[PDB]
Design a protein around this nucleic acid. Structure first.
Ligand SMILES: [K+]
Ligand SMILES: [K+]
Ligand SMILES: [K+]
Ligand SMILES: [K+]
Ligand SMILES: [K+]
Ligand SMILES: [K+]
Ligand SMILES: [K+]
Ligand SMILES: [K+]
Ligand SMILES: [K+]
Ligand SMILES: [K+]
Ligand SMILES: [K+]
Ligand SMILES: [K+]
Ligand SMILES: [K+]
Ligand SMILES: [K+]
Ligand SMILES: [K+]
Ligand SMILES: [K+]
Ligand SMILES: [K+]
Ligand SMILES: [K+]
Ligand SMILES: [K+]
Ligand SMILES: [K+]
Ligand SMILES: [K+]
Ligand SMILES: [K+]
Ligand SMILES: [K+]
Ligand SMILES: [K+]
Ligand SMILES: [Mg+2]
Ligand SMILES: [Mg+2]
Ligand SMILES: [Mg+2]
Ligand SMILES: [Mg+2]
Ligand SMILES: [Mg+2]
Ligand SMILES: [Mg+2]
Ligand SMILES: [Mg+2]
Ligand SMILES: [Mg+2]
Ligand SMILES: [Mg+2]
Ligand SMILES: [Mg+2]
Ligand SMILES: [Mg+2]
Ligand SMILES: [Mg+2]
Ligand SMILES: [Mg+2]
Ligand SMILES: [Mg+2]
Ligand SMILES: [Mg+2]
Ligand SMILES: [Mg+2]
Ligand SMILES: [Mg+2]
Ligand SMILES: [Mg+2]
Ligand SMILES: [Mg+2]
Ligand SMILES: [Mg+2]
Ligand SMILES: [Mg+2]
Ligand SMILES: [Mg+2]
Ligand SMILES: [Mg+2]
Ligand SMILES: [Mg+2]
Ligand SMILES: [Mg+2]
Ligand SMILES: [Mg+2]
Ligand SMILES: [Mg+2]
Ligand SMILES: [Mg+2]
Ligand SMILES: [Mg+2]
Ligand SMILES: [Mg+2]
Ligand SMILES: [Mg+2]
Ligand SMILES: [Mg+2]
Ligand SMILES: [Mg+2]
Ligand SMILES: [Mg+2]
Ligand SMILES: [Mg+2]
Ligand SMILES: [Mg+2]
Ligand SMILES: [Mg+2]
Ligand SMILES: [Mg+2]
Ligand SMILES: [Mg+2]
Ligand SMILES: [Mg+2]
Ligand SMILES: [Mg+2]
Ligand SMILES: [Mg+2]
Ligand SMILES: [Mg+2]
Ligand SMILES: [Mg+2]
Ligand SMILES: [Mg+2]
Ligand SMILES: [Mg+2]
Ligand SMILES: [Mg+2]
Ligand SMILES: [Mg+2]
Ligand SMILES: [Mg+2]
Ligand SMILES: [Mg+2]
Ligand SMILES: [Mg+2]
Ligand SMILES: [Mg+2]
Ligand SMILES: [Mg+2]
Ligand SMILES: [Mg+2]
Ligand SMILES: [Mg+2]
Ligand SMILES: [Mg+2]
Ligand SMILES: [Mg+2]
Ligand SMILES: [Mg+2]
Ligand SMILES: [Mg+2]
Ligand SMILES: [Mg+2]
Lengths: 112, 209, 56, 118, 6, 122
RNA sequence: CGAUGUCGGCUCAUCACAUCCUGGGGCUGAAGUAGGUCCCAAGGGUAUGGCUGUUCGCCAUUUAAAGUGGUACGCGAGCUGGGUUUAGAACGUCGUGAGACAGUUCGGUCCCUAUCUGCCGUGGGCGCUGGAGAACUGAGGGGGGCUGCUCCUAGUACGAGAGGACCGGAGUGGACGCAUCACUGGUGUUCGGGUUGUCAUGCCAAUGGCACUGCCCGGUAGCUAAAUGCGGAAGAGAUAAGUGCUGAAAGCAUCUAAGCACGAAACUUGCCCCGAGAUGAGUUCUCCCUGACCCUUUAAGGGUCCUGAAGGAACGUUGAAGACGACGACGUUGAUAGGCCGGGUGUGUAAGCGCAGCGAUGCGUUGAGCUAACCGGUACUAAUGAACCGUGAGGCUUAACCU
RNA sequence: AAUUCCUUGUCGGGUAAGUUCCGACCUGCACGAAUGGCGUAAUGAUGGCCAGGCUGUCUCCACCCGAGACUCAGUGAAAU
RNA sequence: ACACAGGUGGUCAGGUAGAGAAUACCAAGGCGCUUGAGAGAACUCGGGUGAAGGAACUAGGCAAAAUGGUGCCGUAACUUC
RNA sequence: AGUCGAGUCGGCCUGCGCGGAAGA
RNA sequence: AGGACCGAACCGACUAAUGUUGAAAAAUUAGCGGAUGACUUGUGGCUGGGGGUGAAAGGCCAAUCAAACCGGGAGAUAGCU
């Protein structure tokens, strides 16, 4: 656990910005096609954060070409190139799973 | 070759630069101290006994202590044997370190599985449950028939029934060595290995090639 | 469900070969009051490991 | 299995356990020594010792938290006024369990649990 | 039920 | 995690609106189809004058699932519904000409390169 | 016939081989691909649905394949009760009628706390020849053994073309199994919060009880699968059918008689687990005990006093160990548990006070307060000085060595 | 057909697939007119069949809360 | 047959919510049901929750889940109106 | 039988064996 | 108005689970039907065994019913065990 704490901390990113459930976030992700390495953006609402050191994760919900999509990002994965907060949301809960049953005008989050 | 005795520290992951997350068991392998060398003359087979770790001086018995005194090693928490292959040679008192595994690609890891106590046939043997409803009377997770009739008029040995499950020696074979850290006395192997955190593990180079 | 043959007094005795009770190995003596007690329990006069406790 | 789990069920449901320990915690604070069954005494430490710790810092919020957990203002006042200051410089271990034989009625193993200074 | 019923 | 009896939406303009999985192909007692798996389907609902019709039996490739898909870093991508793309039963090639909604990089193979080419995302 | 529960299904199987698949072969009216047919082979594998009480069968869609049989038409002191198989009722039909029908139709109580054998697990006793603590050897036993597709070889061999290999190699799957919880998740009545009704704490404010945890939303540890690691093997030996080499009997021929070779998922190993009650009770290493006396039936004899080891057990604090036993850790020369301290995690900005608002509320103090089973620490509490069991150098015979 | 043995008759509908169901045909083994025939709104803890919704019924079970089961103390059966 | 989860006619009828003698929580009043204590295995019973799927279960949706109030809008075939 | 140099060929009656010969 | 509707008391008993040496010789739990009537219930009365009574199941007539119970003919008879 001390042993594991040292193995974990040496892989942890130092640059991860403060964000919060209900924030809109843009995550830049590496994608590979052969030997060609693009960066793909995934913008959406943060519906859940797992704070768990190196195992930290966060879930982003986006409506994309008329289809709800959630990505669970592993925060310290090198696949996640950058995270940036586009808009600060005002919610009360830690987890916004109630957004899954809400579309359009019902799904709006007040700014913080 | 020989293996080494280690302790299951727990699990983590190693993120690779190319994006992959590798689940790892972290095995603490402190020095294994040779406590006896079995010879073909005196013992009828070739092997080393090793100890690792430390025992309380007051909880090491006089028989145990005298055995370690002959070796000239500090008492460890136990004694384990490893069969020597032809050509392998070790001396009493020799410390063997995790560096042994430095050029080993795969290992087999042996430990004592977590103890589930008395397990039913559903859990222990993956028996199918019977109907939850449709009239079933008191026979939801019970094993069903355990034999035929007058012929043979008995239950066959090895019949799968409820009983103690887990808390037994298990070997998982052919786990990739992800890292050998001699400085920290660590071996990282890919994937899960038997036993609880804190439990002893025997790590040997993989027998399947 | 039930026996086809009356078990013997022998079989009865054998089944009860594990039923014997075990006397307490030994009683402890309080360092002060001198009185016997179960080890790790207070005495009948309310001592434990020399000091008066309870007081009843 | 119950690997790593804490808390004794004591052949009760949760609401009965909670009520029972609230009563028993009050009894211990009031009388400073009680006799009970040994497993109940061991569980009672996990209830009573946090109350005393809470009572080390006298505030309205703490009086109310204590009140929420005890529901007795005699007990809350005795914590805070008496016990909290009595244990100000003592890092846990406010109680002591002393085993005291077996109960006549059902052979239950019994123990005294007392506040250490009593 | 009847053993070896009709 | 699609199985026999699972209803899927259709992520193409073949004209099927609602299809039901009647077989997970490619193994004895194979339980589930995930993204990129071929299933056998029956059309339960079709639009009036499309390329296919109600009760037609054919193949489809699963392109979105609610269970979703894990990636090598432990990430997961989940969709709000289960959807597939109808394929010709003999030559497993898409019947439609448009793909609707995002697909995943699990279809990035020779068989389904047309689907990837038409999809508006991933 | 002083009762052997009777179809089918479910659950759980086990065996045979007359082999469905996978493996090995011979012949072919075998070019290749794909078949036909026979021989060897039982290691493992061997669909899900629609219909019907069905067995079966037909059908849909799969699969490498959807084997055939035995086991009281395997299995109701294991489940079901659709059918069959009582009493009600009706139809057709037969009968003057009561009634009748392996005709139909709607409805119609399925009991048993396991003594013995067996089987799955788990202990106690004694033994194994002085006692004790360990590590082993491995007689013997069990587990495991399935297979697709794609690519390369190669559009090669073969073929008029159409099509299209063997042998060998690489990858990736299905099903099954073992482990595990790092991840993704479930659960999480022991954590936090929202909220309805009502009762109470004098009242306000704040709280608590009850209503399925009142109803809900989240969620820690643990357990866990849908999660993710790993497995089946290679190799070896001896073979089956089969194919040979050399080779006479029988000047030839002949795989066989002498001799020699090859040959399969079967067999023996190789892999994993159990394992010396293996009474054939094994081995190795270490530790401990080096006192006197008395008597009789004088013997592997029984007492007495002194002695009490190594170690064990007991008791206590306990555990990712556990029904209980057992197994592991720890007992002050101490982190064994609880508490406590710090952290993490979860919930999501407490109370009080202030400000704004007529007010519900909002805002500030404030990511606040609270926070289980987690992590790192810490003798505050509880793990006691003892006592108990276990002895005092371990039979006889013979051999080799005391040289 | 609460009646049809042959029979899962045949044709149509519904389903990917329907021995059941619905419509129809008539070769009624063996319907039929108050031991009523055919129909019929409403009604039925009535029989059959299909949908939507819904779900641990199931794929395939997992975890949790309680009562037993297990251990201790007291009492103390039974069939055979 | 029992200090037996059964049966037994009449009268009385508080508060908050509620249409109510339903239901929840309480008053007056009455009770905790005459073995307890631990533990936290299988399995059984009674419950809670459940990823993806959604009748694939089964003789049969058996059981479960679900629906559920008031007001207003709106409501088909058929019909003995 | 394939010059060669002694037996050879095929039927009959009989003794004892061989295949034909798969099961829970 | 109503053998009207929804729904407690009250009267029933359709389904499932449990129970099956039961808590109970027919119940319990969750649902379920009727609930101003051909309703339900208290007290008392009348009908008697080839007899009663029966919205009919050979149902019921004191845990007994294709002929009650008790005593008697009676030691029926038993080519059966
Ligand atoms: K039943
Ligand atoms: K008979
Ligand atoms: K062949
Ligand atoms: K076989
Ligand atoms: K069989
Ligand atoms: K039989
Ligand atoms: K049966
Ligand atoms: K039987
Ligand atoms: K049974
Ligand atoms: K019949
Ligand atoms: K027996
Ligand atoms: K996990
Ligand atoms: K969890
Ligand atoms: K309240
Ligand atoms: K031995
Ligand atoms: K054990
Ligand atoms: K605030
Ligand atoms: K505040
Ligand atoms: K916080
Ligand atoms: K007829
Ligand atoms: K008539
Ligand atoms: K008429
Ligand atoms: K009579
Ligand atoms: K007589
Ligand atoms: Mg365990
Ligand atoms: Mg099943
Ligand atoms: Mg029953
Ligand atoms: Mg049940
Ligand atoms: Mg026998
Ligand atoms: Mg006993
Ligand atoms: Mg713990
Ligand atoms: Mg109890
Ligand atoms: Mg409650
Ligand atoms: Mg008999
Ligand atoms: Mg054969
Ligand atoms: Mg065999
Ligand atoms: Mg049978
Ligand atoms: Mg039964
Ligand atoms: Mg049976
Ligand atoms: Mg029936
Ligand atoms: Mg029939
Ligand atoms: Mg008949
Ligand atoms: Mg007939
Ligand atoms: Mg085997
Ligand atoms: Mg964890
Ligand atoms: Mg979760
Ligand atoms: Mg919850
Ligand atoms: Mg208030
Ligand atoms: Mg109350
Ligand atoms: Mg109440
Ligand atoms: Mg020759
Ligand atoms: Mg502690
Ligand atoms: Mg936090
Ligand atoms: Mg609050
Ligand atoms: Mg017929
Ligand atoms: Mg037809
Ligand atoms: Mg259907
Ligand atoms: Mg018809
Ligand atoms: Mg008629
Ligand atoms: Mg007429
Ligand atoms: Mg009529
Ligand atoms: Mg007892
Ligand atoms: Mg009583
Ligand atoms: Mg009444
Ligand atoms: Mg009420
Ligand atoms: Mg339980
Ligand atoms: Mg539920
Ligand atoms: Mg679910
Ligand atoms: Mg769901
Ligand atoms: Mg079905
Ligand atoms: Mg079925
Ligand atoms: Mg139902
Ligand atoms: Mg319900
Ligand atoms: Mg012969
Ligand atoms: Mg009415
Ligand atoms: Mg009645
Ligand atoms: Mg009821
Ligand atoms: Mg009605
Ligand atoms: Mg009503
Ligand atoms: Mg009759
Ligand atoms: Mg009667
Ligand atoms: Mg008569
Ligand atoms: Mg007479
Ligand atoms: Mg007589």
């Amino acid at each position: 656990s001390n042993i594991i704490k040292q193995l974990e901390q040496e892989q942890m990113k130092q640059d991860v910005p403060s964000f919060r459930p209900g924030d809109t976030v843009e995550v830049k992700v590496w994608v590979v096609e052969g030997s060609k390495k693009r960066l793909q953006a995934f913008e959406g609402v943060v519906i859940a954060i797992r704070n768990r050191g190196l195992h930290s994760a966060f879930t982003v919900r986006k409506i994309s070409n008329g289809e709800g999509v959630e990505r669970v990002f592993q925060t310290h994965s090198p696949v996640v190139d950058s995270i940036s907060v586009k808009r600060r949301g005002a919610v009360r809960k830690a987890k916004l799973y109630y957004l899954r049953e809400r579309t359009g005008k019902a799904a709006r989050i007040k700014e913080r | 070759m020989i293996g080494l005795v280690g302790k299951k520290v727990g699990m983590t992951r190693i993120f690779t630069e190319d994006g992959v997350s590798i689940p790892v068991t972290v095995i603490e392998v402190e020095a294994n101290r040779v406590t006896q060398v079995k010879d073909l003359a005196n013992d009828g087979y070739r092997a080393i006994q090793v100890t690792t770790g430390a025992k309380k001086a007051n909880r090491v018995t006089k028989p145990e202590a005298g055995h370690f005194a002959k070796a000239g090693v500090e008492a460890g928490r136990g004694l384990w044997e490893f069969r020597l292959a032809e050509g392998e040679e070790f001396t009493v008192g020799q410390s063997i370190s995790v560096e042994l595994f430095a050029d080993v690609k795969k290992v087999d890891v042996t430990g004592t599985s977590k103890g589930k106590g008395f397990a039913g046939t559903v859990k222990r043997w993956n028996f199918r449950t019977q109907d939850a409803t449709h009239g079933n009377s008191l026979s939801h997770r019970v094993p069903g028939s355990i034999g035929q009739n007058q012929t043979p008029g008995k239950v066959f040995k090895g019949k799968k029934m409820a009983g103690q499950m887990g808390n037994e020696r298990v070997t998982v074979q052919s786990l990739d060595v992800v890292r050998v850290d001699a400085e920290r006395n660590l071996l990282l192997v890919k994937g899960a290995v038997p036993g609880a955190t804190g439990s002893d593990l025997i790590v040997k180079p993989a027998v399947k090639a | 469900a039930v026996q086809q043959n009356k078990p013997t007094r022998s079989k009865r005795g054998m089944r009860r070969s594990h039923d014997a009770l075990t006397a307490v190995t030994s009683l402890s003596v309080d360092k002060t009051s001198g009185e016997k007690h179960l080890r790790h329990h207070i005495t009948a006069d309310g001592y434990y490991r020399g000091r008066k406790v309870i007081a009843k | 299995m119950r690997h790593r789990k804490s808390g004794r069920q004591l052949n009760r449901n949760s609401s009965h356990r909670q009520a029972m320990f609230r009563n028993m915690a009050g009894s211990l604070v009031r009388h400073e020594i009680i006799k009970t069954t040994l497993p109940k005494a061991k569980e009672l430490r996990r209830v009573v010792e946090p109350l005393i710790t809470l009572a080390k810092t006298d505030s309205v919020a703490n009086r109310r938290l204590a009140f929420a957990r005890t529901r007795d203002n005699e007990i809350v006042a005795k914590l805070f006024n008496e016990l909290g200051p009595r244990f100000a410089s003592r890092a846990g271990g406010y109680t002591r369990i002393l085993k005291c034989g077996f109960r006549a009625g059902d052979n239950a193993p019994m123990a005294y649990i007392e506040l250490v200074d009593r | 039920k009847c053993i070896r019923a009709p | 995690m699609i199985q026999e009896q699972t209803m899927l939406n259709v992520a193409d303009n073949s004209g099927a609106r609602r299809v039901m999985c009647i077989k997970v192909l490619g193994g004895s007692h194979r339980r589930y189809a995930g993204v990129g798996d071929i299933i056998k389907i029956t059309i339960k609902e079709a639009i009036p004058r499309g390329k296919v019709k109600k009760g037609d039996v054919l193949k489809a490739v699963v392109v979105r699932t609610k269970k979703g898909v894990r990636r090598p870093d432990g990430s997961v991508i989940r969709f709000d519904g289960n959807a597939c793309v109808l394929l010709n039963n003999n030559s497993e090639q898409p019947i439609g000409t448009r793909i609707f909604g995002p697909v995943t990089r699990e279809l990035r193979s020779e068989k389904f390169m047309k689907i990837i080419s038409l999809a508006p995302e991933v």
